[PDB]
Design the sequence.
RNA sequence: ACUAAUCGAACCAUCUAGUAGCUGGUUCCUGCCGAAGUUUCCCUCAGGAUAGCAGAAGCUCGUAUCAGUUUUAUGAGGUAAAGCGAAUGAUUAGAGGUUCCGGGGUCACCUUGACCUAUUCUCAAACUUUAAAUAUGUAAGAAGUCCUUGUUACUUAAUUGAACGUGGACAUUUGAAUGAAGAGCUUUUAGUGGGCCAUUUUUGGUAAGCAGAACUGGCGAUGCGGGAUGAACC
RNA sequence: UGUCAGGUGGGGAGUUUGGCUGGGGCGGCACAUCUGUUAAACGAUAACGCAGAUGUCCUAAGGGGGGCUCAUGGAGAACAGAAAUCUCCAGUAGAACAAAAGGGUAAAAGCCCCCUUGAUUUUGAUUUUCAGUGUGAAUACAAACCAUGAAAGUGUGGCCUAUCGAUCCUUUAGUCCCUCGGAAUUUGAGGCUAGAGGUGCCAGAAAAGUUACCACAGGGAUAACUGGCUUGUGGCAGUCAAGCGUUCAUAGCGACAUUGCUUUUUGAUUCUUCGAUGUCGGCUCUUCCUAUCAUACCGAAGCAGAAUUCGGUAAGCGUU
RNA sequence: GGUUGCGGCCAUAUCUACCAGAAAGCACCGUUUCCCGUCCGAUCAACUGUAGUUAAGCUGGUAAGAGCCUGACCGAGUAGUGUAGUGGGUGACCAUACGCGAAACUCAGGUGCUGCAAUCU
């Protein structure tokens, strides 16, 4: 009893009825996979500038 | 049976160009990449490390990570009915700056120059690009250009 | 025949009334329906929509 | 081609619309060629289209023009105050052609009153059919469908 | 494959925490050592009537096993395990290759 | 015996040459491709007559061999063997497979065929102008051994060269033409002058 | 064979409404929406799980992050074609030179085989110097551009950079076209997971109303006018 | 005699005795994978499609550095030659790089020499397969410790693309940490972290046959029969004409080729039928077709007659 | 403008043959005590720019040169290909309509350009 093996028939019609979506970009992307040495220093850089505005704007 | 290895079906994809084998020239190593740069991916068969998969051949992405001898690139890949964010670690031999970003970065510069010139006087200086317009009417003269052409030619065997 | 670009006969997907059968909540909806229509204040339109919400959509404050 | 027809707002047979001729639109026309008959409309063709079958798109509703104040309430920002102001923006493709043309609901034409003048429609106008660019003969075709 | 019986590698012995000299020997499993809880559970479940109560593997396919090296540091006597790929023959520190030998004999 | 040629008439498969993936292909039944006065100079035979296929199809090496003998024998019997050079143009490089349930149906090599296009020359005959009708009749009798439509074409080229008859005469008047083995070598306006004097000494007149 | 018309394990009752991925059936109306025979895994191939397609409940907002489309700009590809006096591998034919195991023939040879040199006929799904069409990636801006200076334990010979910032300037032609039917987002669940047909590309086969793929459109799930007649054709 | 222990025990009991598949069985593995092609120039893509390969091998064939340049051809030097050692010239790689194929590599990724163990520790992140799960393999790092080199740098196994494995259980290494629940000590045991012992039907049951005495649920998802498609093969025709026929291609034949027809062969397919269309042959009886054996009338002959052979109209009528 | 060092693109730069090159630089060259490496100061190392030579390297020029590079209404809008028809044809295939569009071929031109620093009748 042989049957069909594979077909991509109807697979693009199915993928388009819900309108293929772009990945919804954001400002401030995740720092996942960024170099740890840069990321470790960026933590200290953001802390200092947060204090700089805190000391001035208050 | 079937074979679906990592570098399958890449016999011509990862070939070098004709008379362009050998060592990679130093320009690829002196190019500076930064996070946010838009880069094109084209693998070098001579460099087997940090080498992209055959899918990302010809794909354009944005640099998210800068490393010692490699670059992290963001590519959106279509899986099923949506796009998925993908992250590659590629040595600089396999990437280059996409030149499309540089003309756009010159158009924004030239847009600001035209707007600054138009600030004092002459507003509405057409910052936007326009498509090719239908041609305007013009006069064509026959002075030295009298029309003269034959009809379709008969059928000869030519052999 | 029409080459339809969007699904036909689609309900908005938003509550136009509370599912609740509380008679006094219906009177509050009746009052704020008039206010949302007879005033241009966006506050009245927000309150009227919030009166339609289900229990999980209005957590305690 | 079906997507391009949706982008030109031709969602049913005998529907019509105006298209500004640029390069960016000529391949759209070149890509739906087997399904549409188009050409270059005369001023008399545009005037009879807007007068008889001209409907405005006002808050997603297809509203008959039938009054200048209807057009002024929606296109008066661009200077279009009358039904001939709207017609003028179409025939002479003005700065606000995009807004004026989009304000017009797609024209709902009938079948041609004298027929299509061909045995079979679905060959090119050059090849004896009906689709394609029939540039100045579109006025004869549309006036029998209006 | 041929592996030397000595190796300088990382010892995380809490007293070295650096590369030190190691002795290399092959790992053997060790006696089954009944009174293991699984063996205690096995003996009770097998007792009485019912026959063989647990599966017995027969469909073996591999003709090799992976080689495990026990890496004992020579100063703090700390061990470490390293696993090599499957090989049919494995010797330890035996007759390193020579390249300038004369084929003679 | 052999399958009828209607089973392999049309170019239905990809080109399937003998290579390192067959290593068991039989031999084409046509082995001689140049016949008659093949050692003749270009000056002897100005007239060229072409048997040209008008179909995209496959001619088997058996049909090629049968038609080559049929055309050659008539030209020798009527006008002598040394009055013509018959070069058959198409080479049977494509291998025909035969399957002899549908399980494991990939076929063994059955024969050879030449894949020909519309307008592709099958037979080329260069002769003198006096026996035009002889070779035209020889190719006309060779058509019966082939499937599909073929046309007898009178070439406007001097023999087997790629030059028109007046073009060859104009170059041969000068030292631009030297006789060679069976074909001809022409003068180029490029290259070293020392090579262009030792070759074509009769030029520079 | 026979063992009460019962025999390759009688009859009666109970466990027992034994299990069944298998067959059959599954009962009122109207309204709206509306499929799949495909992915992966499974002692899996008449089944299920999973993702997809679908409904419902909506929620946050109010014309936008957008688009089965084009243009502009910039990438990528090695198929159609083409090429073999270009590489690899086949392949026809003579020319010229040459020297060794090759030709009996000097004791230097019209009537020679290789090899080299310039030509010549024809080819390649697992050849290629070239190389389309169609298809395909990215970008076309306020999350932008420019100026000045603040943080850092990173980085630099060095505020030199890196990243993120303070403050200031720029606006409806704000940085192509067209459209936008509201846009985005979530939960939950049905059915389905036998497909088949047509154009074009394409594999096996002599072929098939054969068997197997790619893109699309359909039938299934669909009546209507036409092809007398017919699931798919117009 | 009773209990336990070892053996024996189809006499008896219970159960098992893969899957894909142009039906099933046999064969094979298309069941987990790798290379090229099919594959239609992004990617993806099937068949028991084509050409092949994997379950290994390597303390170097891993890592670093230095020096050098390979295959082949030519010209030379006592035996010594097409050839054994030495010398020079040419040489874009025509070599070599473990193993298939593809890609890559020339002051190297090949050869030789020197040093070496980065084939090490601790985690996250990423790519392929993909559900964006697992496994395998790989990529760039970070924090250590090292190797090498003058140094920059390189190195987290093999130049790249394959070379492999859950739960339960056992076992080892590490911490020398947690628990044995009345409190301790020491054995023992149980935990945590990281490996191995293996499932090749490769996301991983523990498994022999036979039934021609057979049963059930079903299946026309699937064979054996008729019918339907095709016509390789079977059969029946045609075109060309090298030749046979004493001479003469075509009276009669006819090579090498090539175009068809038929569905009374056999293959091929699996569309119908498995809540069943009674499966061989003969007898009996009717009818139909023509590709005509006889009969009627003819045309041709290498037809003198006789007898024959070829061909036409023709299925009316017969064919034991 | 020549030359040297370090380069960029990597033949318009390569290859073959033959000619020129003042000055400077480069080079060949001379030597073996030390550091160093060899069977061999050939290479590699060191030492003196001294005893000498542009012969070679190098540079440039010459060639109806090979190759390479650029362009062409050169071939050719040809082959091919997207879309369409109840188009043709028994078929193989072909033509037309709206678009895109090659390679070989044939000609013409060319034979490195340039960055940083130093130096030169
Ligand atoms: Mg199925
Ligand atoms: Mg592969
Ligand atoms: Mg590696
Ligand atoms: Mg009428
Ligand atoms: Mg009509
Ligand atoms: Mg017991
Ligand atoms: Mg085929
Ligand atoms: Mg094929
Ligand atoms: Mg019984
Ligand atoms: Mg029941
Ligand atoms: Mg029951
Ligand atoms: Mg509906
Ligand atoms: Mg839905
Ligand atoms: Mg390809
Ligand atoms: Mg081709
Ligand atoms: Mg090819
Ligand atoms: Mg089912
Ligand atoms: Mg159904
Ligand atoms: Mg009909
Ligand atoms: Mg009908
Ligand atoms: Mg149609
Ligand atoms: Mg038994
Ligand atoms: Mg592909
Ligand atoms: Mg190696
Ligand atoms: Mg206790
Ligand atoms: Mg399994
Ligand atoms: Mg499995
Ligand atoms: Mg089980
Ligand atoms: Mg079927
Ligand atoms: Mg019956
Ligand atoms: Mg008859
Ligand atoms: Mg010396
Ligand atoms: Zn230690």
Sequence:
């Amino acid at each position: 009893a042989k049957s069909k093996n594979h077909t991509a028939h109807n697979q693009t019609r199915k993928a388009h009825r819900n309108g293929i979506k772009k990945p919804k970009t954001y400002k401030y992307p995740s720092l996942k996979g960024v170099d740890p040495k840069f990321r470790r220093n960026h933590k200290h850089a953001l802390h200092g500038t947060a204090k700089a505005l805190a000391a001035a704007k208050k | 049976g079937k074979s679906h290895g990592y570098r399958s079906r890449t016999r011509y994809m990862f070939q070098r160009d004709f008379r362009k084998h050998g060592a990679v020239h130093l320009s690829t190593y002196l190019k500076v990449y930064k996070v946010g740069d838009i880069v094109d991916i084209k693998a070098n068969g001579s460099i087997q490390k940090g080498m992209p998969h055959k899918f990302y051949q010809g794909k354009t992405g944005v640099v998210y990570n800068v490393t010692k001898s490699s670059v992290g690139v963001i590519i959106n890949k279509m899986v099923g009915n949506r796009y998925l964010e993908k992250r590659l670690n590629l040595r600089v031999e396999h990437i280059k700056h996409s030149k499309c970003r540089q003309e756009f970065l010159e158009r924004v510069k030239a847009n600001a120059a035209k707007r600054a010139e138009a600030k004092a006087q002459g507003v509405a200086v057409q910052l936007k690009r326009q498509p090719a317009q239908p041609r305007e009417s013009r006069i064509v003269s026959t002075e030295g250009n009298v029309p003269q052409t034959l009809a379709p030619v008969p059928y000869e065997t030519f052999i | 025949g029409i080459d339809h670009t969007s699904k036909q006969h689609k309900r908005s997907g938003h509550r136009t009334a509370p599912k609740s059968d509380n008679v006094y909540l219906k009177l509050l909806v009746k009052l704020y329906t008039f206010l949302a229509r007879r005033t241009d204040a966006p506050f009245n339109k927000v309150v009227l929509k919030a009166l339609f919400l289900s229990k999980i959509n209005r957590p305690p404050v | 081609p079906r997507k391009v027809l949706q982008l030109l707002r031709l969602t049913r047979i005998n529907s019509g619309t105006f298209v500004k001729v640029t390069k960016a639109t000529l391949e759209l026309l070149k890509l739906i060629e087997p399904y549409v008959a188009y050409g270059y409309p005369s001023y008399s063709t545009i005037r009879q289209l807007v007068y008889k079958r001209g409907f405005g798109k006002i808050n997603k509703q297809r509203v008959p023009l039938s009054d200048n104040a209807i057009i002024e309430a929606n296109l008066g920002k661009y200077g279009i105050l009358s039904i001939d102001d709207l017609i003028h923006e179409i025939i002479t493709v003005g700065p606000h052609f995009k807004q004026a043309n989009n304000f017009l609901w797609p024209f709902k034409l009938s079948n041609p009153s004298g027929g299509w003048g061909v045995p079979r429609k679905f060959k090119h106008f050059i090849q004896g059919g009906s689709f394609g660019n029939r540039e100045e003969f579109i006025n004869k075709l549309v006036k029998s469908m209006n | 494959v041929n592996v030397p019986k000595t190796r300088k590698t990382y010892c995380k012995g809490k007293t070295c925490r650096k590369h030190t000299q190691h002795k290399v020997t092959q790992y053997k499993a060790g006696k089954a050592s009944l009174f293991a809880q699984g063996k205690r559970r096995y003996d009770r479940k097998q007792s009485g009537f019912g026959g063989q109560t647990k599966p017995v593997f027969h469909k073996k396919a591999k003709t090799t096993k992976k080689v495990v090296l026990r890496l004992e540091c020579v100063k703090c006597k700390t061990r470490a395990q390293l696993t090599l790929k499957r090989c049919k023959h494995f010797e330890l520190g035996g007759e390193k290759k020579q390249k300038g030998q004369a084929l003679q004999f | 015996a052999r399958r009828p040629a209607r089973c392999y008439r049309y170019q239905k498969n990809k080109p399937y040459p003998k290579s390192r993936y067959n290593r068991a292909v039989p031999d084409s039944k046509i082995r001689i491709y140049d016949l008659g006065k093949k050692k003749a100079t270009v000056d002897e035979f100005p007239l060229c007559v072409h048997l040209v296929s008008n179909e995209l199809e496959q001619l088997s090496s058996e049909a090629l061999e049968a038609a080559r003998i049929c055309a050659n024998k008539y030209m020798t019997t009527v006008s002598g063997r040394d009055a013509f050079h018959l070069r058959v143009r198409v080479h049977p490089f494509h291998v025909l497979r035969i399957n002899k349930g549908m399980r494991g149906a990939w076929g063994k090599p059955h024969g050879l065929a030449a894949r020909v296009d519309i307008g592709q020359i099958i037979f080329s005959v260069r002769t003198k102008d006096s026996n035009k009708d002889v070779v035209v009749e020889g190719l006309r009798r060779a058509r019966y051994k082939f499937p599909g439509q073929q046309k007898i074409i009178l070439s406007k080229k001097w023999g087997f060269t790629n030059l028109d008859r007046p073009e060859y005469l104009k170059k041969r008047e000068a030292g631009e033409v030297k006789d060679d083995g069976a074909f001809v070598k022409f003068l180029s306006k490029k290259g070293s002058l020392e090579n262009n004097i030792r070759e074509f000494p009769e030029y520079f007149a």
Summary: Helices of chain C lie at 23-38, 42-50.
